RNA sequence: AUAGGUUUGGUCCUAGCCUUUCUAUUAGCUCUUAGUAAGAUUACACAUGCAAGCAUCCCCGUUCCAGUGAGUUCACCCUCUAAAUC
């Protein structure tokens, strides 16, 4: 079947394409500061500490799962017409039993008409935040997510901040989460700011979105210009496996394209700007020969 | 009357501001007057009472061209620690309590508008499992009464008592009776 | 019948535990005999007015 | 400065640094050790450094010490069932003794995490009450709800003075 | 501008030192009065000078006229300069506990933005030196001259990270909570690296101060500690 | 603890005096039909019984 | 509130609590509704009591609890 | 559930034997000084039933809680003598010893 | 504390401020003060509509069931709240009051028609 | 405590007292509005009016709530086991 985002193979290629820069991953945070500690270590001990930091970064860079938009909840439990007109405002009942997953937690609404129905997704999230507050999440939607403030955030090249705020505020399968993430990805593609997301956990999701929407040209060009040729070839391979019935896949199979030939075949078959891909690849090869 | 009221940030890029303050914060040269070596733990409520300035106005009140606005990000940055991102308490800079509250509100508004950079942490997911198959969020099978349109229990509806029982009640409560009530309206009267 | 929310919770628990039965949850009231309020109570357990 | 050699032993951080939480069976721990003799060195250190930590993590276990009563050091644990556990500690370092006692009679990390999760349930985040027990005092502290009249006066229509 | 108090000479600036007979100018140096005393009459002044970039000193001047004492003290101070090593040019390299005569000075290295929470004379001397973040507590007799001497001695006898690396022949690696588990190597020996590690001291035999432990455990309750103050 | 013996004596004496001065049914449940009140206590009966 | 030793107010000695009048049909319907509601609530209460007792029994002599006890004893040995 | 006595198993030194079939035992526990954060010994006296009167002053004994107190102050019984005074047997090797010296060598057996 | 007789009951303890009520659903001894000692807090109830026009009710259903199975009684407002939630059948008085309101509004509409 | 003033003809040391900070009560002088919280000094004496009824009679409740701080290691944990709810 078609690979899922969480498959071992796709996860491995996305992890290798993301990269791991310890300086960017553990950049100094602006927060309450304490006096630093110091240790005397040998070369072996320093290497041990470096590998432990690499493991910590690997844990930090764990990609969030990519989920499909949740179906709206429209379910009625009861219709007690006797209660119609006896109340002016709806009652929201939340079951706050502690040891229950929040997606298995019963939340219901008794409307003024007497209808006992299941709470909508937005109401469910609001109630869960009210009674089980999560750090970083606000009961009322923050104004930063309005598209004007989002343009401002993008203009300041703070896309990672926007994605972190989105992850803190919205559930992965919510409409707002998907919309904000897609808008950020669109801005990144339109302004060639892919390097902002490298060495972060959102790069895999961005690459997945670009591949699924067949708009990997800009990312491929950026990778070629940054001499990450292996990443570009792996991106072409991921495009082929995600679209095995596409012209690029059959072209690579027919011409037996490996390595750079895969990129050339993709540029000739299914590239919206294949000419610039060819130009950049030729420039990269010429520079490689000169070096 | 300040010509920078509509666009406060302009004042911070003017040559008058550079001459007055240079590169140091607007509060750098201010000093509170008080008794003792330990100052009071709060600043004065306000430097302006009934449109009259006090003898030693704070850094904000001493310059009428300095406007506390969420768009004047450069001014607001001077009252936030660049190394920890925390707003200085009022005694730190000597700003009066009113101006300190206004500065805090403006800084929060600028941060909420994406105009002021602040540390946003990376948080973990709320739930460990994202399945939406449970009945709490899925569709519960309708009960037979719901399908048939009947009330959940038969006694939710009014059933007219037999005449014999009504006569028995009338005998039981001789002289202490109201008018008998018939079946209620089927729907809520509009 | 069970109350609406309790019925829904019972059905959800059954579906979570793998049970796919379509039988409605039902409350047995055969063991609940509603005795008329005017039935004689136990006079042996009743108290007595104290002398004052 | 702080009195005595190794004053760090008399700080709550060091006392809490111990990793030995005895099972409920243990009631008494006797420590027979010798003040002199190289082979007992670790035992002496075990008395000097780790007995305070063990007692701190096990306040109800009776720990008693005995000096120069036997040719070799040893530990004896008395259990509630009446069983006795003898641990020879001659030639062993203090860290080795700690690891051995933790292995044979110490609660594993799984039980400790289970206990911590059990403690977590007592403080329900949804409950409202004094800050000593609850995150929030009133629902008025929740955004979107009607705020406290102390900070924001209620509309005249919602006040009994102007409803009467 | 007033000094530490309205009627106090301490903390008042005397301007740059005069050009010396050697022919050297000192326009980048600032002078601050630390003490003025009547000698029974003449005037004895203790002053400190510094350029704000690690070079600082202090001197005593005695004269019948106060201005002559100021000039003498300043001119002698510029010729007895210390150099003070600064970690990242804002703080000290490590905590320093010293006792000069009966005056005890405990100084603590602090992160950026912490400010100067120190005795007012220590604040002035730090500003002259260029130290921007440090904590200091003075105990015993508060004698200005002894305080200055002990401060300068302790600040001049601090070991830098490079010196420690050369002495131990090992990498000095800094761990910052804000930077996560990233190891930041701040100093490496100029010579070869020793291959055997430092002994993993299970419990070091360090001399702890009861005030620091009490503060860490929360048993310190002083109404005067951690009070809000103006920027220093 | 300093014993409280007077309490013991009082409880025993009250128990004995309540067991020996029991009001009888003829006294407790007599009724004055003109006012419909209990002469023993003076409390009037509920209206619905009159 | 008053204790049993406090005298009754002199303004209430002649107080007669007149019972409220009765609407026969509503009275009968309400009586039946109360009977049915109390029956249902008693059934729910018995089921909740049974669940509580079952949980106590499963905590003390449950099969999982006994397996855990045996495992702990074997580990100790 | 097995006893109403708080202290179930305790180890102490016998300090008195003048009562018939009853040993007065001194039990030491470690109590943390709240200010100094140092552990000091806190002493408590217990009366233990000694049916055979085999306890001598100075020996280290183990006491087990009685199911119920047999007297006002007797809530325990002598389970065993851990160390007989001057007649200690090394638990590790099982050989008699006088202080830190073996009276009978372990190798002899 | 030992009370003469009594029983556990799940009820509403009133908190908040003047003209701003709020309720804590608590299982407590019936003889204890309304806002005094309780055995366990079983939920909350905000009777004032919020910015979304909703009255928020939180119910610890597991603990409510546990305490009902332990012999705890219920105050009438709690029976009405649980009936509204659908946890219990609708209390008879809610139905009766709804019918009374229906008849009263029918009388008002008939008055309007007569005029 | 980031400390400061004060002993001597003068220096250093030791040592007390006081100053600077934050609360609460009372007193002087002064005092515009709105919301909220809190509110005899006295276990001294109390005019007056209320603070416990319900209910087909029996019972039940008035042993609760509310008040005070005189006295003062009856409050907490374990064992056992009355009364009470289911
Ligand atoms: S404390 Fe919540 S309304 Fe006042
Ligand atoms: K009654
Ligand atoms: K008292
Ligand atoms: Mg002055
Ligand atoms: Mg003094
Ligand atoms: Mg003098
Ligand atoms: Mg006043
Ligand atoms: Mg019983
Ligand atoms: Zn001001």
Q: What is the CA radius of gyration of chain C?
A: 22
Does the beta carbon of A144 lie under 8 angstroms from any beta carbon of chain B?
Answer: yes
Tell me the HSE value of A141 on the side-chain side, using a 13 A CA sphere: 15
Long-range contacts of H31-38 (CB under 8 A, 24+ apart): H32/D15, H32/D55, H32/D56, H36/D10, H37/D10, H37/D11, H37/D12, H37/D15, H38/D10, H38/D52
A140 CB neighbours in chain D (<8 A) are 143-144
Query: From the CB of I17, is ligand 1 less than 6 Å away?
Result: yes
User: For residue A240, which of A253, A230, A227 has the smallest C-alpha distance?
Assistant: A253
Q: Where are the domains of chain H?
A: 1-109
The answer for residues whose C-beta is within 8 angstroms of residue E47's C-beta and 6 or more apart is E14, E31, E32, E33, E34, E58, E59, E60, E61, E70, E73, E74, E77
User: For residue B25, which of B76, B85, B91, B100 has the smallest C-alpha distance?
Assistant: B76
Of A77, A85, A127, the CB nearest to I86: A77
- In a 10 Å sphere around its CB, with 0-12 CB exposed, 13-18 middle and 19+ buried, how is residue B69 labelled? middle
Between β-strands I73-74 and I8-17, what pairing exists: parallel, antiparallel or unpaired? parallel
What is the three-class DSSP state of D88? strand
Gap between the Cα atoms of B22 and B44, Å rounded:
27
Strand segments, DSSP code E, in chain H are 9-19, 22-32, 39-49, 60-65, 74-83, 97-98, 101-102
Which tokens in the block code for residue I13? 């303890």
User: For residue E12, which of E4, E24, E23, E20 has the smallest C-alpha distance?
Assistant: E4
- Alpha-carbon distance values, E199 to A41, A44, D5, D8 (Å): 11, 15, 20, 18
Q: Where are the domains of chain I?
A: 1-115
Gap between the Cα atoms of D53 and E148, Å rounded:
43
* DSSP secondary structure letter of residue B156: G
Q: What letters, b where the CB count within 10 A reaches 16 and e where it falls short, cover G34-57?
A: bebbebbbbbbbebbeeebeeeee
Do D65 and D47 touch, CB atoms closer than 8 A?
yes
Do B87 and B107 touch, CB atoms closer than 8 A?
yes
> Helices then strands (H, E): number in chain G?
2, 0
Tell me the HSE value of B98 on the side-chain side, using a 13 A CA sphere: 11
Question: Phi-psi category of I16—alpha, beta or left, where left has phi over 0 and alpha has psi -120 to 50?
Answer: left
User: For residue H19, which of H37, H42, H46 has the smallest C-alpha distance?
Assistant: H46
Instruction: Report the 10 Å Cβ neighbour count for I62.
Output: 15
Do D8 and E208 touch, CB atoms closer than 8 A?
yes
Please say whether the dihedral angle defined by the alpha carbons of residues D115, D119, D120 and D121, taken in this order, is positive or negative: positive
Gap between the Cα atoms of B74 and D78, Å rounded:
70
Instruction: Phi first, then psi: give them for residue D108, nearest 5 degrees.
Output: -75, 165
Gap between the Cα atoms of I58 and F15, Å rounded:
51
Gap between the Cα atoms of A247 and A243, Å rounded:
9
Do A217 and A268 touch, CB atoms closer than 8 A?
no
User: For residue A158, which of A107, A223, A202 has the smallest C-alpha distance?
Assistant: A202
Do B33 and B56 touch, CB atoms closer than 8 A?
yes
Query: From the CB of D138, is ligand 1 less than 6 Å away?
Result: yes
Q: How many residues does chain D have?
A: 164
The answer for residues whose C-beta is within 8 angstroms of residue B105's C-beta and 6 or more apart is none
Does the beta carbon of E223 lie under 8 angstroms from any beta carbon of chain D?
Answer: no
Atom of ligand 1 nearest to the CA of D139: 2
Beta bridge partners of H46: H25
Which tokens in the block code for residue G13? 């000695």
Gap between the Cα atoms of A206 and F40, Å rounded:
92
Of G35, G44, G47, the CB nearest to C34: G35
Q: Give the distance (Å) from ligand 8 centre to CA of residue C48.
A: 22
Which tokens in the block code for residue E12? 């008042």
Gap between the Cα atoms of A22 and D113, Å rounded:
31
* DSSP secondary structure letter of residue E103: E
DSSP assignment of A148-194 equals HHHHHHHHTT-HHHHHHHHHHHS-TTSHHHHHHHHHHHHHHHHHT-G
Of C27, C31, C34, the CB nearest to G44: C27
What would the 3-class secondary structure string for G5-22 be? CCCCCCCCCCCCCCCCCE
Element (H, E) at I54: strand I54-59
Which tokens in the block code for residue H55? 């306890």
Instruction: Phi first, then psi: give them for residue E81, nearest 5 degrees.
Output: -75, 140
Gap between the Cα atoms of A147 and A152, Å rounded:
9
What is the three-class DSSP state of E70? helix
Gap between the Cα atoms of A118 and E68, Å rounded:
90
- Alpha-carbon distance values, E160 to D128, E193, H47 (Å): 53, 18, 65
Which tokens in the block code for residue A248? 């690029």
Cross-chain residue pair C24–B135, CB shorter than 8 Å = no
Element (H, E) at E160: none
Strand J at less than 7 A from CB of E103: yes
Gap between the Cα atoms of D123 and E112, Å rounded:
37
Gap between the Cα atoms of A103 and B92, Å rounded:
47
* DSSP secondary structure letter of residue I71: T
Question: Which position has the token pair 């004379």?
Answer: E121
Please say whether the dihedral angle defined by the alpha carbons of residues A257, A262, A264 and A268, taken in this order, is positive or negative: positive
Q: What is the CA radius of gyration of chain F?
A: 18
The answer for residues whose C-beta is within 8 angstroms of residue H1's C-beta and 6 or more apart is none
Strand order in the sheet with E30-39: E30-39, E42-50, E55-63, E82-83
Gap between the Cα atoms of I107 and B161, Å rounded:
22
Query: From the CB of I20, is ligand 1 less than 6 Å away?
Result: yes
Q: In chain D, what's the furthest Cα-to-Cα distance? A: 92
H-state helical runs in A64-143: 121-131
Q: Please report how the helices A147-155 and A175-191 are oriented relative to each other, as an axis angle in degrees rounded to 10.
A: 40
* DSSP secondary structure letter of residue D50: I
| Subunits in contact with chain A (3 or more CB pairs closer than 8 Å) | B, C, D, E, I
Do A132 and A102 touch, CB atoms closer than 8 A?
yes
Question: Which position has the token pair 């309720």?
Answer: I23
Gap between the Cα atoms of B118 and A29, Å rounded:
10
Gap between the Cα atoms of A258 and A203, Å rounded:
25
Which tokens in the block code for residue I75? 């105050």
Do A9 and A68 touch, CB atoms closer than 8 A?
no
Question: Which position has the token pair 């034997």?
Answer: H17
């Amino acid at each position: 079947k078609k690979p899922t985002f969480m498959d071992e193979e796709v996860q491995s290629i996305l992890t290798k394409m993301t990269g791991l820069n310890l300086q960017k991953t553990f950049k100094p945070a602006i927060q309450e500061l304490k006096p630093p500690t110091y240790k005397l270590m040998t070369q072996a001990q320093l290497e041990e500490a470096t590998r432990q930091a690499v493991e910590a970064a690997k844990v930090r860079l764990k990609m969030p799962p990519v989920l499909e938009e949740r179906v709206p909840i429209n379910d009625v439990l009861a219709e007690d017409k006797i209660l119609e007109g006896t109340e002016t405002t709806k009652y929201v009942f939340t079951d706050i039993s502690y040891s229950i997953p929040h997606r298995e937690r019963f939340i219901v609404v008794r409307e003024p008409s007497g209808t006992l129905r299941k709470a909508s997704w937005e109401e469910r999230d609001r109630m869960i935040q009210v009674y089980f507050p999560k750090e970083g999440r606000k009961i009322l939607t923050p104004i930063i997510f309005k598209e004007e403030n989002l343009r401002t955030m993008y203009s300041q090249d703070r896309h990672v901040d926007v994605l972190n705020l989105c992850f803190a505020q919205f559930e992965p399968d919510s409409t707002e989460y998907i919309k904000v993430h897609h808008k950020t990805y669109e801005d990144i593609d339109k302004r060639g700011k892919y390097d902002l997301l490298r060495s972060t956990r959102y790069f895999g999701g961005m690459v997945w979105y670009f591949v699924n929407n067949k708009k990997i040209d800009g990312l491929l060009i950026d990778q070629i210009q940054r001499d990450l040729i292996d990443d570009a070839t792996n991106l072409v391979q991921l495009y082929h496996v995600l679209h095995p019935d596409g012209q690029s896949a059959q072209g690579a199979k027919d011409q037996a394209a490996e390595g750079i030939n895969l990129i050339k075949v993709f540029a000739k078959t299914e590239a919206q700007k294949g000419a610039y891909i060819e130009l950049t690849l030729q420039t990269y090869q010429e520079a490689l020969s000169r070096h | 009357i300040s010509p920078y009221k509509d666009e406060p940030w302009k004042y911070l890029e003017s040559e008058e501001y550079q001459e007055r303050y240079g590169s140091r914060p607007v509060w750098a040269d201010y000093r509170r007057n008080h008794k003792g070596g330990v100052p009071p733990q709060r600043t004065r409520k306000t430097c302006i009472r009934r449109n009259k300035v006090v003898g030693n106005p704070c850094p904000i009140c001493r310059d009428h061209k300095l406007h506390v606005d969420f768009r004047n990000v450069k001014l607001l940055e001077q009252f936030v620690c660049a190394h920890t991102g925390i707003i200085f308490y009022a005694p730190y800079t000597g700003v009066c309590v009113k101006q300190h509250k206004r500065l805090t509100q403006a800084i929060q508004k600028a941060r909420d508008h994406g105009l002021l950079i602040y540390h946003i942490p990376q948080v973990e997911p709320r739930d460990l499992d994202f399945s939406t198959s449970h009945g709490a969020v899925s569709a519960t099978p309708p009960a037979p009464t719901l399908v048939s349109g009947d009330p959940w229990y038969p006694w939710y509806n009014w059933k007219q008592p037999p005449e014999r029982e009504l006569s028995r009640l009338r005998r039981l409560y001789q002289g202490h009776l109201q008018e008998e009530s018939g079946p209620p309206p089927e729907s809520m009267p509009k | 019948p069970y109350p609406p929310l309790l019925r829904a919770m019972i059905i959800a628990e059954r579906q979570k535990n793998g049970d796919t039965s379509t039988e409605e949850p039902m409350l047995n009231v055969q063991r609940i005999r509603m005795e008329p309020w005017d039935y004689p109570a136990k006079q042996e357990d009743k108290g007595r007015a104290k002398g004052t | 400065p702080m009195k005595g050699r190794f004053p760090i032993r008399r700080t709550l951080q060091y006392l809490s640094q111990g990793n030995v939480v005895f099972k409920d069976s243990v009631k008494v721990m006797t420590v027979n050790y010798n003040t002199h003799g190289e082979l007992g060195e670790g035992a002496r250190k075990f008395v000097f450094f780790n007995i305070p930590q063990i007692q701190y993590k096990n306040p109800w276990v009776q720990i008693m010490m005995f000096k120069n009563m036997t040719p070799s050091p040893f530990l004896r644990f008395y259990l509630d069932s009446g069983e006795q556990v003898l641990v020879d500690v001659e030639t062993k370092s203090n860290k080795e003794i700690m690891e051995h006692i933790r292995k044979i009679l110490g609660k594993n990390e799984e039980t400790l995490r289970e206990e911590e999760e059990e403690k977590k349930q007592l403080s329900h985040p949804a409950n409202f009450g004094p800050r000593k027990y609850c995150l929030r005092e009133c629902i008025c502290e929740v955004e979107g709800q009607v705020p406290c009249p102390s900070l924001v006066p209620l509309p005249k229509e919602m006040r009994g003075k102007y409803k009467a | 501008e007033r000094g530490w108090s309205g009627n106090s000479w301490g903390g008042i600036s005397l301007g740059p030192p005069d050009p010396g007979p050697c022919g050297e100018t000192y326009e980048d140096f600032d002078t601050r009065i630390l003490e003025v005393r009547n000698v029974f009459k003449s005037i004895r002044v203790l002053v400190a000078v510094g350029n704000g970039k690690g070079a600082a000193g202090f001197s005593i001047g005695k004269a019948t006229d106060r201005m002559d004492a100021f000039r003498k003290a300043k001119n002698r101070a510029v010729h007895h300069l210390h150099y003070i090593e600064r970690y990242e040019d804002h703080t000290i390299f490590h905590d320093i506990s010293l006792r000069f005569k009966r005056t005890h000075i405990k100084m603590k290295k602090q992160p950026k933005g912490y400010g100067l929470r120190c005795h007012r004379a220590i604040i002035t001397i730090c500003r002259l030196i260029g130290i921007k973040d440090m904590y200091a507590k003075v105990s015993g007799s508060i004698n200005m001259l002894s305080l200055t001497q002990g401060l300068f001695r302790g600040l001049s006898r601090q070991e830098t990270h490079q010196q420690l690396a050369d002495k131990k022949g090992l990498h000095v690696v800094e761990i910052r909570e804000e930077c996560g588990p990233l190891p930041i190597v701040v100093a490496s020996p100029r010579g070869p690296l020793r291959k055997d590690p430092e002994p993993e001291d299970e419990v070091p035999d360090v001399k702890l101060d009861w005030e620091d432990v009490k503060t860490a455990q929360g048993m310190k309750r002083s109404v005067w500690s951690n009070l809000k103050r103006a920027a220093t | 603890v300093r014993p409280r013996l007077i309490a013991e004596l009082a409880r025993r004496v009250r128990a004995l005096r309540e067991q020996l001065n029991r009001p009888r049914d003829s006294q407790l449940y007599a009724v004055d039909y003109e006012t419909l009140t209990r002469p023993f206590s003076g409390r009037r009966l509920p209206v619905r019984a009159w | 509130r008053k204790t049993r030793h406090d005298p009754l107010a002199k303004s209430k000695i002649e107080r007669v609590n007149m019972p409220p009048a009765v609407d026969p049909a509503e009275f009968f319907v309400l009586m039946e509704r109360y009977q049915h509601y109390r029956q249902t609530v008693r059934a729910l209460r018995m089921e909740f009591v049974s669940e509580v007792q079952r949980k106590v029994h499963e905590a003390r002599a449950g099969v999982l609890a006994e397996r855990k006890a045996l495992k702990d004893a074997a580990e100790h040995r | 559930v097995r006893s109403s006595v708080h202290a179930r198993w305790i180890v102490g030194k016998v300090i008195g034997t003048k009562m018939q079939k009853t040993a007065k035992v001194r039990v030491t526990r470690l109590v943390l000084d709240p200010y100094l954060l140092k552990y000091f010994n806190k002493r408590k006296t217990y009366f233990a039933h000694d049916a055979l009167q085999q306890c001598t002053v100075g020996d280290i004994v183990l006491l087990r809680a009685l199911p119920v107190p047999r007297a006002k102050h007797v809530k325990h019984e002598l389970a065993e003598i851990v160390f007989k005074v001057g007649k200690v047997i090394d638990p590790v090797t099982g050989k008699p010893c006088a202080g830190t010296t073996y009276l009978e060598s372990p190798l002899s057996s | 504390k030992a009370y003469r007789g009594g029983h556990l009951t799940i009820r509403l303890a009133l908190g908040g401020c003047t003209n701003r009520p709020f309720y804590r659903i608590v299982a407590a001894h019936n003889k204890c003060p309304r806002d005094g000692r309780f055995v366990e807090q079983l939920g909350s109830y905000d009777p004032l509509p919020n910015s979304h026009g909703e009255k928020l009710v939180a119910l610890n259903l597991d603990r409510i069931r546990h305490w009902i199975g332990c012999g705890a009684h219920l105050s009438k407002p709690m029976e009405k709240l649980l009936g509204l939630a659908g946890f219990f059948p609708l209390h008879p008085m809610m139905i009766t009051n709804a019918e009374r309101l229906r008849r009263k509004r029918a009388r008002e509409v008939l008055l309007a028609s007569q005029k």
